[model samples]
Target: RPRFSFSIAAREGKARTGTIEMKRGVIRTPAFMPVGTAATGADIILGNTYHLMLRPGAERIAKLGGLHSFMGWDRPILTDSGGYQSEEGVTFKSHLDGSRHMLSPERSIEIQHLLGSDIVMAFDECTPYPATPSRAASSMERSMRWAKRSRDAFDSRKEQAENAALFGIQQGSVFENLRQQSADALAEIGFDGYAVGGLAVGEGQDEMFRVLDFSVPMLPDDKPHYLMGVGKPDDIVGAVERGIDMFDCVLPTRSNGQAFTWDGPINIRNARFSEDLKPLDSKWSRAYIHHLIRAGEILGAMLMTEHNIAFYQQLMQKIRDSISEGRFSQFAQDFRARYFA
Candidate 1:
C-alpha cells in the first residue's frame, strides 16, 4: 500500500467531505476523532506522545505491539510529537517522577514510530500566547528547522516510513506575513500532511478564525489539513467552514459531570434539570438523572461521559452529512445559534 493519501469526495463552500486513506483504514474528512476513550463514530483516534512517552515509555509500547494493540483499537492512530523547542531538542523534567528527559525532532519521530503512529506530527514549540513579533518569528523559525529535521528522520526509518505519514506544523502566531513565510518553508521541506499549529493556545475565537482565514489557504490544498489541540463543537464547525479536514479535541470526553444536549450543556446536579423530562440517558428522566447526581452515584459521571462522546460524534456525523449535501452553510449558522443559546 502507498504511504498515505487524501481525497476530497465532496465540498460545500470551504467545508469538505472526503477520506484520508491509510494502510490501517480510511478516515473520513472533517473527521472528529475522539481522544483516548473512543466512541461509536470515530474513523481515527489521537495519542499524545508527550504523556505516553513519559508514562508507558515508547520503548515499552513498542515491545507491547504499539499503540493500536496497547490501546486495543484497530483504526488509524495519529500521534502528536510531544511539543518541541530547539534544533538540539527539548529537555525537561518528567511530570511522572520529575526525572530529566529530552525530546529532539528525531527522538520524537522515533517515539511515535515505536508507538506505531500512522500519522506522526512534527514537533513544534507551543508558541506561548502574547508573543511579540520577534518572538513569534523566532519561534516559527526554529519550528521550521525542526520540521526539516523531522522530515529527514521520518525518511531515515525505511521500515516505519513505508506506511507512516509525517505532518509539518505551520506556526507564525497571528501575523499573515509570517504565516505565509512559515507555509513556504514547510512547502519546501514538504510533508504528507500539514497542521495549523500555534492556535487554541490562548487566542480567542475571533483572533483564531482571523488567523485561519489566511493560514488555511497557505497550506497545500490536496493533502489533509488538521487543526491540532482544538476545540469545542462550535469551533470545529467554524474551522471546517475554513477548510480543515481533520480534528481532535478533549472537551467532549472531559464532561466534568455536565450533560450535553441540543439546547446546550447542562449542570445535571445543578437543579435546573429537575423538571426537564427527556434526557441523554433515555432510560432515565431528567429529574431521575439529577437524583443520581445527588446520590453521588459513579454511574452519573460514566453516563454523562458516554453521552458527551456519543453526542459529539453525532454532531460530527451531521457536519459531514451537511457538507456533502450542500447544507453546511445552513447547518453551521443554525447549529451555532442553538448550541450557544
Candidate 2:
C-alpha cells in the first residue's frame, strides 16, 4: 500500500463524500480539476505534458524551471497522459507543424516528468467512442503495458520519485469484463491512486453512468477513484453516486469560451435571451454575464467558467461534507432533485 489513503467523510445511497490524503496535500473527494490547455487562458488551472511538451519542449520547460513556475500556479497539478490525444477519433491537430504524431505510454510519461506535475497520471489509452469489445480490450492491454513502464520511469527519476504521486488510469471501455481486467492489472502493479479513463470521450451520460455503476466498485477502496475527462452538470452527481472520488474535464471552460452556457444540456443560445435581463443563476446571473458576452468580451468566458468550476467544487464539497455527516444518501437525492433545473 502507498502512503495515500481515502476515508468517507459523508453518504447519500451510492452518492457520498470523502477526502484523499497523500504526501503532497489532502484532496477533498469528489474534486473537480480544471483543464488548462495552452490556449485556454486557464493559466491558474492545471496544464499537462501533452500540450507543453509538444510546444515549448520539455527540456525548455525544465530549463526555465518546473511546471509550477512555468505555469505560475503552485497549487497541486495533475498531469494526464496524452492517451486521448493519441486516439484516431480525437481530432486535435498536431501542435508541431500540423503533422500527425503518435503518443505511446512511455513517451507520455517522459513528457509528464519533464513538465513536473504534482500528481502524474499513468499513461493509458482512451478507447475511442463507438468502441467494439475487441478494440477496447486491445487498447487496454497496451495501456497496461505502458503503465508499467510509466511507473518504472516515475520511480527512476529521483525528484519525481520523491515528490510526485503516480495514479494509474483504468481503461476497458464499457465492457464489464474488460473493466475488471483493467482494474485487476492496476491493482497488481500498485499505484498511489486509480482513475477510470476512457469515458467522457463523447459517450453519452446513460452509457457513462452504466460503466461507473459496476466499474467504480472494482477499484480498491483504499485508493482514490478518479473519473477522467467526464461530464456535464448531472453527470457529476451520477458518477458520485457510483463512488467516484476525483474528476477533470474541459466541458465548462470550453463551452463558456464559445459564449455558450450550460444548464443541464440545454443550449441557451436562442434569440429569446436578447432582451431577457435575468441572470443565469440567482446567485450568479445572466444579467452580469450578458453585458460581457454582448460586448464581445473575454471576461465573460472567464467569469462564467470560473463560476461553473466553483459550482462543481462547491457541489463536491457539499457531498463530502454531507457524507461525513452521514447524510450522503439524502444529500444525493436532494441534490438531484434541485440541480436539474
Candidate 3:
C-alpha cells in the first residue's frame, strides 16, 4: 500500500466528503486546490511540473528542501505532468524563451519527485476534442502505457515514493467502452488514485457529465476519483454528485477582475460597480476595487484572487456539510436556484 491514504468521512447519494492523508498534511475531499501561482487559502495547492522544471528547475527546488520550503507553503502540493504527449513524450516549446522540450513519463515522475509533490499525476496525452473513435483509442492506449512508466519511475525513487502519491488518468474521449478499457488498463497497473481526463477540452458540460456517468464509476471506488481541468461552480457541484473527489481549475484565479460569489461570477470591471459602494463581503467595496483595477493597481488582482479562492473554499465547505447532513441533492438544487436567480 502507498504511504498516502484516503478515507470517506460522509456521503450523500454519490456526493462525498473525505480526507486524503499525506506526509505533508491532510487534504479534504471534494476539495478545490487553488493554483499556487495565483491564490491562497487552500490546504492543498497545484504546481505545474512543466513550468517549474523549466524556470528554477527541479534540482534547484529539491536542493532548497523541496517545494514546500522553496515556496514557503507547508501544505500538500499536487503537480500536473504537462498537458499533451505522444508515445515518446509530451513535446512543447518553452514559454519563457521559445526553446523546445520533451517531458517523458519517467522524466515527469522524476521532476515531481524532485519537487517533493504530495500528489503526482501520471504523464498522459491530453486527447484533443472531436477525435475519432480510433484516434481516441490509440491515445488512451498510449496514456495507459505512459501511466505504467510513471508508476515505475515513481517506485524507482524509494524515498520520494515513500512520501508521495501517484494518480493515473483515464482517457477515452467520449466513448464508453474505450473508457472502460482505459479504466481496466489503469487498474491492472494501479496507482494511489485515478483521474478522469480528456474532458473540459471542449466537450460541453452535458457531454462531460455523460462521460463521468460511465467513466467515474468504472474506477475503483476504494480510491479517490479526480476530474482534471474541470470547471465552473456548477461543474464542481455536478462532478461531486457524480462521484468525483478532487478538482483543480485555473479559471478562478485566471479570470482576473472577476469576483466569484455564491450567486455566480460578477465582473468588478463593470461600469455598474463604479458607484456601487457595497462591500463584496464586509471589507472592500466594488467601487474601490473597480477604481484600483481601472488604474492598473496590482492590489486589485490580489484582492480578487483571494476573494475567488475564499468563495471556492466556502463552496466546498458547504458541499461537505450538505453531504454530511444527507441533503446534497437538495442543497445543489437550492444553490443553483439562488445562484442563477
Candidate 4:
C-alpha cells in the first residue's frame, strides 16, 4: 500500500471533516495547506517543483534527505509539477533565468519522488477562464491524456508508489459536459484522490461554486475531493459546503500589514491605530503594529504574516469543530456575521 488512508469522521449538510492518515502527519479537512513562501500553524505545506527545481533543485533535495529534512518540516508536503501543455510534454523557459526545461508526465513524477512529496499532483494544463468552447475542450482533452501518462509513470515506480500517493486533476473550464468528460477520464484511470481543476482562474466565485455543485458529485464520493487553486477565506468555506475536502492557494510576498480577526481583517497601518493599545493576541499592541507598519519596519511584516496564518488556522479549527458537532450552518452563519463585519 502507499500507506495513505482517508476517512470522513462527520458530516453536516454537504460539509464534512475527515482525516488523511499519512506517515508524516494526519491532515484534517477541510484543510488549507499553506504555501511555504510559507506557514505559521499549518499542518501541511505546498511546494512547487518548477520553482524548487530552478533553485537548490530536486536532485539536491533528495540527497540532503529529501524536502522535508531539508526544510525541517516533519509534516506532510504537497507539490505541483509544471506549467504547460504538449504531446511530448511541456517545454518552457524558467521564469527566473529563462533556461530551457521540459516536463513530461514521467519527469514530473520523478522530480516529486525525489522531493519526497507525500501528495504528488499530476501535471495538467490550467484552462484559462472565458475561453471559447473549442479552446476549453481541447485543453481539457490534453490534460486527461497527460493524467494517464502521469498514472502510468507513477505506477512504474514501485518503491515510490509504496511511500507516496498521486492525485489526478480534472480540467474542463466550467462546462458541465466537459467537466463530466474530464471526470470520467480520471475515474477510468483511477487515482488516490481527485482534484477539481480549472476553476479559480479568474472565474468569479458564483460560477466556480456552480461548477462544483455538479462537478463535485461527479467524482468518487468515497475518496477525498480537492479543489485546485481555490481561494480566499470565504471561498474555502463555500467549497466545503459544496463538498470539497482540500484546497491550495498562495503567494504572500507583501503582507500589507493586516490582521485577520473574528471581526474581519483589520488594517494595522491605519492611523486610527496610532494610539490604540489593544494587542492582536497577547504579545504586541495594535499601536506598536501601526507604528512599525507606518515606519516600514521588517518586524511589522513578520508579525502580520505569522498572525494571518494563525487566524486562518483558528478559522479552520472552528470549521472542523462546527462540522463534527453538526452545527456547520450556524458556524458559517456566525462566521459571515463576524468576519464580514
Candidate 5:
C-alpha cells in the first residue's frame, strides 16, 4: 500500500501548491477543476453519486462501462457522495421522469465506487445558509455523523481503500465555532484531503471569504484544501490567497453557452457591444464574440467556451507559478486590484 504525499512545491503566504498522484493521474494543485455536475465540457465533470444512482442506476452505469469510459475522460475524476443533496430536498421533481427519490451516505459512496472516481468527497449535508446559530450547529452535527458513515463505507471498499482517496468536507455555514467543530470531527476521522463546503450557495463573496479566512487554516495544513463551487475571477484569487488549493465551478462554460462572455466578465448581449470593435477582453474582444452571437453560430459558443476555459486555466497556472516563485501574495494582491478595482 502507498501513502499520499504533499510537498510545498511553491508558496506565497498561505497560498501554495504541489501535486496529488492517484491511480488516475497527477492533479496539479491550485488547480481549477471544471464542474460538470451532471455533464461534461471544459470543467472536469463531477459524477454526483446521488444523481447517478437515483436516475441512471449505479448498476446501469457500471454496465455501460463506468463513468470515465461513458464520459470519455481518462484524466482524473472527482465524485461527491450524495450527502449534501440529502438536505437539498432530494425528493424534489424527478430529473428524468419527474419522480422522486432519496440518497444517503452509504448509497452515495457505493455509487461513486461503481462509477470509479479518483477523488471522492465525504457524504455530509451542506449546512444551509441564513442559518441561526442553532440551525447551523445541528446541521454541522448531522454532517459529522454522515461524514463518519461515509468514511466507514469508504473503508469497507477494498479497492478504494488501496487506491482512491477520500476527502472530508468541512461544514459550518458562516459560524466560526461550528466550522471549528466540523474540522475537529474530520480530523478525528482523517482523510486524503479537506474541503470547505457549504459556501457559494447563496452567501455573498465577502462572507464566503471571511469564512475561508478562518476555516481553511483549521484543516490539516499538509493535505490538500478544496473550496467547492466558488465564483467569479476575484473569488478564486481571493480564496487562493487565503491558502485554498483546489476548486471547481461552472461559471465559464455555462456563461459561454448563454452568450455571457467575460474577460473580466461582461455581457456580450449588452447593446454596447453591437458596434464595438473591441474584443471581449483585449485578448478576446467583444467584437469577436459579437459577430458569433449576431450570426447565430454555434462556433460562437464553442470558441467562447474554449477561450473561457483557457482563460481560467491560465489564471490557475499563473497563480501556481507565482506561488512557486515566492511572489504569490504580491501577485494575488495585484490580481484583486485589477479585477476589483
Candidate 6:
C-alpha cells in the first residue's frame, strides 16, 4: 500500500492545483468527485456507507471483492461515515426501510474499510444551521470524540489500515471558535486528510462562504481539505478560491433532465428548448432531447446526465489550468459574468 500525500503543483491567490497520491490512484486537487452514491465512472466518486450497507450489507461487499468490483469503478472512492448528530454511534433507523441499525465511529470506520475505500471520512454529526452556541459546541465536541474513535478503529485493522486513508472532519456549525476547537482536536488525533463538514445544509452560498472564510484556514493546508456535499458550479468555484481542494456532491449526477454548461444549468424540459435545434454538444440535439424527455424516454435522462458530468469535469480542468497560470481570479470573474448572465 502506498502512503497518501498531497502536493501543490501551483497556487494563485488562495486557489491551488495539486494531487492526492493514494494506493488506488492519484486524485487531482481542486477536484470534484461525482457522487457515485447510486452510480459511477469518474476519477473519484463518493459512496454513502449507510446506503451501501443497508442494501448489500458490508460482509457481502467484502466477499464480493469490495466496492470497486461491486460497482465497476476502479478509481479512487471516498465514503462518508454515516454519523448524523441526531444520535450517537448507531441506533438510527435505516433510510431505506426504516430498519434498526447502528453506525458508531468504530462501525463507520469498519464499514468503509470493508468497502475498500481509498479515503474514509471521520464519523461526525452534521450540525444543522441556526444552532445555538451551546448546541453547536456540544455537537463539535462529540464529533471530536468520534474522530478519535474513528482513527483508533482505522488503526485497529492492520490490513485495511495500510491500504486506506482516513480523513478527519471539522464540524462546528457556523461558529468560528467552535470550528477552531474542532480543527485543533482533529489535528491532535491526526488523519491522512481533513474535511470541512456542516455546510451546504440549507445555508445559502454567502453564509457558506463566510464559514469557509474562517473554517478552511483552520485545517492543515499540507493535507487536502475537502468540502462535503458541496454544491453547484458557482458554489464550487467559490470554495476552490477559499482553499478547498476536494469536493463531493450529488447534484451533478442525481438531478435528472438538467444540462450543465459553463454558461449555467439548463432544464431541457423548459418549453424554450422545444424548438431549439442545437445539440447538447456536437453529438446530441437539444430538440431531440426535449422531444425524448417529453415522451418519457430513458435515453434523454442518460444523455443529460452524461453532458452534465462532462461539464463539471471540464470545469475542474479549467480551474486547475487557471490556477496553474496565476489567473484564477480573472477566470472566476469572467466565468461569473458569463455563467450568471
In order, the Cα lDDT scores of the candidates are 0.85, 0.72, 0.87, 0.84, 0.77, 0.85
Question: Candidate 4: lDDT of 7?
Answer: 91
Task: Tell me which of candidates 4 and 6 scores higher on lDDT.
Answer: 6
* Per-residue lDDT over 177-285 for candidate 3, one digit per residue giving the tens place of the 0 to 100 score: 9999999999999889999999999989999998898889899998999899977999999999999998899888887588887767899999999998898764899
TM-score of each: 0.95, 0.85, 0.96, 0.94, 0.89, 0.95
Ranking by TM-score: 3, 6, 1, 4, 5, 2
TM-score of 5: 0.89
What are the per-residue Cα lDDT tens digits for candidate 5 across 82-124?
6554443244455678665566677778778888887888878
The C-alpha stretches of model 6 lying farther than 4 A from their native spots are: 37-41, 84-88, 95-99
Q: Model 4: per-residue lDDT, tens digit, 1-341?
A: 22788899999988879988887888898888887765435778987787888887788988899988888888889998766345878777778888787888889999999999889999888888888889999999989999999999988998678878889998888789999999999999999899999888888999999999999999988888999876677888889999999987662323487677778767888889899898876378889888887899988888888777776777788889999999999988888887787
Q: Candidate 3, which ten residues in sequence have the lowest lDDT sum?
A: 82-91
The sequence of per-residue lDDT tens digits that candidate 1 reaches over residues 1-341 is 45688988899887888888898898888887778653437778888787888887999999999999988988789899986334698888887888888888899999999999899998788688879999999999999998999999999999778988999999999999889999999999999889999999888999999999989999988888899877787788899999998888778777656766777777788777777788564366777777777898977666777777777778888988998888999999998788788
Least accurate 10 contiguous residues by lDDT in model 4: 249-258
Worst 10 residues of 2 by lDDT: 36-45
Instruction: List model 2 lDDT by residue over 138-190, tens digit each.
Output: 99998888788789878888877777788998999889999999999999998
- The alpha-carbon deviation from the true structure for residue 58 of candidate 5, after best TM-score superposition, in angstroms, is 2.7
lDDT of 6 at 38: 36
Error in Å for residue 177 of model 2:
1.3
Candidate 1, clashing residue pairs? none
How high a TM-score does candidate 2 get?
0.85
What are the RMSDs of all candidates, in order? 1.8, 4.1, 1.7, 1.9, 3.1, 1.8
